Design a protein around this nucleic acid. Structure first.
Lengths: 155, 95
RNA sequence: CGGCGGCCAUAGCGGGGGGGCCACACCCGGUCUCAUUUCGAACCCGGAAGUUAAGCCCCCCAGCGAUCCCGGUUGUACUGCCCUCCGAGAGGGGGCGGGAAGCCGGGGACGCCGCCGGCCACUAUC
RNA sequence: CUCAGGCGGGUCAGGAAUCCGCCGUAGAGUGCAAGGGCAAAAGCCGGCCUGACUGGACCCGUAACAGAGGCGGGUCCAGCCCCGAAAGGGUGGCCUAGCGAACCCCUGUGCCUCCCCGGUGGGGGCCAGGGAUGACAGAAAAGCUACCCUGGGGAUAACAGAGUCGUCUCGGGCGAGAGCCCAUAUCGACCCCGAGGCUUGCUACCUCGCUGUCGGCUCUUCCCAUCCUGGCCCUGCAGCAGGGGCCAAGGGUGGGGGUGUUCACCCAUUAAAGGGGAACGUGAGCUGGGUUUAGACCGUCGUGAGACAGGUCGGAUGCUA
RNA sequence: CGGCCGCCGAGACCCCGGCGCACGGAGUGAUCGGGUAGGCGGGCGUGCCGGUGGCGUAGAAGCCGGGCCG
RNA sequence: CAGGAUGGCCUCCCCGGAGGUAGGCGGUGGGGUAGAGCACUGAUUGGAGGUGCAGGGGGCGAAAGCCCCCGGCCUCCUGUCAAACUCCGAACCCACCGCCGCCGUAGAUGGGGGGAGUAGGGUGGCGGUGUAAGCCGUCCACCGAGAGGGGAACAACCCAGACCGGGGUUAAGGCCCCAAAGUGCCGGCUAAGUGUUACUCCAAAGGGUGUCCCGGGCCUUAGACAGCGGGGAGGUAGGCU
RNA sequence: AUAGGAGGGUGCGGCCCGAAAGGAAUGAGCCUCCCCGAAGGAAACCGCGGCGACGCGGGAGUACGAGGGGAGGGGACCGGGGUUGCACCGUCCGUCUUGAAACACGGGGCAGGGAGUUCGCGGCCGUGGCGAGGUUAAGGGGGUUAAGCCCCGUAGCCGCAGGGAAACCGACAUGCCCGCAGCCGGGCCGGUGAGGGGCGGGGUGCGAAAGCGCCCGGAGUCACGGCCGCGAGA
């Protein structure tokens, strides 16, 4: 099936408690935590209530491998790599990504790796802010596969 | 309470369409409800003598047993565990 | 045909036909068991000679009613969610998630189903 | 066994009770508020009958969740009856209002118990039933304080401000209507929309370890929706003189008589004798007349003490910047 | 007013080490770090007693000013 | 009632022990608020056609006499609209089961014990009252007790939840100067010093051949759009007064 | 003696001194080279696009980067103190309050004084002794200069049986089923399961009768300290 990337625009303040709990099951906790979520009808319904609170959009495998390599750690600053992955369980970062595509191994399952990728701020300004939807010019909600673009700027 | 003893937030809640009014099929009065069975409790206002407080409406319990003609149902009203005695008229099978 | 039910008008109204109706009605005797603060009308004891004409059963017709659906109005009315988004402090709108009634047009629908007997039957006529 | 009500026919003054048929899903009735429920009934009738019963639970309301007494109902079973052919029903009135603690007393019934010991008298007690707190989870209860005192409070009244703008003031739009005729020379209803903070009121925000009231007096600032002076336009402007409109705060806008009086009334003058804000400007500037304390009288009311937006007389104005 | 583009700009968010807390034995924590009322727990200082062990005219305590640590 | 006590609630300790369901979806339950309407219970506005009748006017008078008529009393296809009306009814809230998610054996889920505290405010939504401001319900981020950056400053509007030091990049918001960063770009609107103010700050109905932009009508050598050169007949004084 | 204030904080300059206790001369502030190097990340110029502002490709995650390591140079201050200029920020303190910088309350300044203590009882807790028992009070004997400690004293209290108004009566040294800890066997699972939970039966009271209430398969007692209530002036 498909895997999606969800990033929390508005944090652990300025939230109602129903929405804040909805967010917790998704494994988001702060602003700039990102998570990979599979399409499942329960998960999808959740993502939909939450939408204004978050930036969402479909992520590919190739961008996932890129993302696993640079931002990933368990301890300290330490780039994930084939040798590091080998000791992990797998033999390759790609096999880990393809098992995430299949939906059979989540990020957490894949050992010595966090279910959250702690990203940088965006780059440049915003040209319709973030307080208004992608459709109006912001970034909020489902947004193509353009989540790929944002995380590249965020490095 | 000052305006509660069995009635408050009723009139219209106990009111029905004229098509759902008239004393209902005989089958439901006769209907037996087993123990270990999960029952919805629904207020039937056609039968006075043995009818839930409106607060109880739409609760789902498990039949704990029976006293007489009525059955004794354990329900959870909120957090608190309570047992309510009611006639077969005010039970419907879950599924 | 019958009897006992379930869903409880999708089995309502109206009109039409037949009976594959001893047995179910009308109908006839009421002395007796028995119903009437008046009448065997009612209730009950008794019988079937006569009538299928109801009822009752079966079939059919939708014009009325009720059940359900399609399309139009309408994704409109209305709404959950967010905004240094707009207005002089009310408030509203957009996105996002949903989306009703009344009415018009076009239709299915004048039952279905379960058990048991019975002239006839050994089956389904009904 | 099924209803108000309607329809037609009979009876009567129409009508009712009463009669006959047809229509009639509930509008009837159920003691009584309201609501809900109900048509082979809880409605109607006839007969029988008195369970509106004793005992002990269960559950909920009471008091949602979630503590919370008393009390109420519903629901069981045990016992005794009742009715019914039996099944089955009846723990009063279709349901929800019509109830009451701790304590004390008395009733009904039996027993327990009463100081070395018995008999008797007379007591005490278990249970249940009945009896009030109605200011109703239950003190034993009438007033005054301006002769007052204290603790506190700006959680809260009086002054002022802030907020507010119904009330008030003022404006604009529409133009019924009269002005001989002609809505606008002039006057202008019904209705509708703003502005101001200047009357009244609402607000309880600010102060109760004080932000002293009103009026006058004196001294000064500002504003214009401008009374006069200047400059202008119309006219149902002949003149003389009015009426209406526009600009404009530069200057001026007085003195007397009554009231404590802001305000208001009056006289004669005047070119005109304009208004409003500034701690209802101005009491560490005056005055202290009025609001107004402890003294007193009268009217009204009260048994009385005593009261008054009734009248009235007299009743401190601190301080060296 | 309707589009569009480049930047500026927080204790946020990111990042390196240190530090406490929580957990691990006789390193680990994306899912730890605001704080009144209030609860809980640890240490310091003060006077005198007892026990133990020292110091003083070859200069006590106190005072004053300066250094250093936690 | 400017007061106590008992819960809810807060903390600490102890005990038992495996699921728990704030989240989301489907299945199985409950429902009359927005909306909507004439089908009741219901209040009423308006004209028809009935002339069914109680009666205030008339007629063959025997003043509503047999029979028709007119205030009119109430049917009928119609006619206004309805917290306490309904032929109806969302979005949405909530009960329960399964699943999935997440959380948990460093102890959740629940129980017992000890020690407390027991003036609230506030923006928004949905309201009820009251012109309003104010008061009071309900849910709520938050302030209260919580900093920091931004909104000129501005308890609660925005961003953000904060161990110590260092480096980097953005967010809210801004980019003429004060003040970091645009004497930005394209096009339309503007001539009022409007505006340059999300705001707590920032006045309306009405009206202007003031503008710009879209609409279909009239009408174009069948060319008056205005000018101008010529126009304004005869019956006839239309009659009356 | 032409410039602004809750009197300062932080950074960075000036001026001023610094014998000691500090760190360092066995090398201080300081300087230089080489390398590793988080988050981050250019420039010149070129090419191609875009109405243009400007984007895109290559340069390039390169140059560059906090921080750290090593080596080297120099040779006495540096830290730290006094005061002050500049940049930036900054409306006391305590109390009251929903909100305090406050036109709410209180304070001239400094020093000294200055407010959770004792007893009884009850409910908790921790530690410690002993154990179906535990604990002694008063007193005199004794010992000592006195006295405490040491021994005697068991008076008396509490627990070992509860229900009941009293009369008065009077029980399970665990039979059945789960399951935590733990143990055991197998490869999470299956037993055994104290503690524990869930039944059954029993004792007593009310009771024509039935139905409910309490109790029941051995742990308490005393000491010390502390926590808190209530009573006391508290």
């Amino acid at each position: 099936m498909a895997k999606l990337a969800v990033i929390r625009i508005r944090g652990r303040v300025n939230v109602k408690r129903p929405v804040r709990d909805t967010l917790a099951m998704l494994r988001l906790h702060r602003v700039n935590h990102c998570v990979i979520v599979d399409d499942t009808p329960s998960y999808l319904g959740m993502l939909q209530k939450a939408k204004d609170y978050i930036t969402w959009g479909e992520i590919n495998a190739e961008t996932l491998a890129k993302l696993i390599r640079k931002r990933g750690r368990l301890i300290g600053n330490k780039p994930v790599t084939d040798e590091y992955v080998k000791e992990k369980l797998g033999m390759t970062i790609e096999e880990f990504a393809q098992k995430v595509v299949n939906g059979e191994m989540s990020l957490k399952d894949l050992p010595n790796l966090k279910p959250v990728f702690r990203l940088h701020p965006p780059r440049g300004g915003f040209r319709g802010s973030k307080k208004r939807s992608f459709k109006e010019g912001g970034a909020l909600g489902y947004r193509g596969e353009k989540i790929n673009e944002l995380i590249e700027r965020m490095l | 309470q000052k305006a509660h003893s069995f009635r408050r937030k009723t009139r219209k809640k106990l009111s029905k369409h004229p098509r759902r009014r008239g004393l209902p099929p005989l089958t439901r009065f006769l209907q037996e409800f087993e123990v270990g069975q999960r029952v919805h409790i629904v207020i039937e206002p056609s039968y006075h003598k043995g009818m839930p407080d409106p607060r109880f409406h739409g609760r789902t319990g498990t039949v704990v047993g029976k006293r007489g003609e009525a059955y004794i149902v354990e329900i959870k009203d909120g957090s608190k565990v309570k047992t309510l005695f009611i006639h077969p008229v005010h039970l419907r099978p879950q599924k």
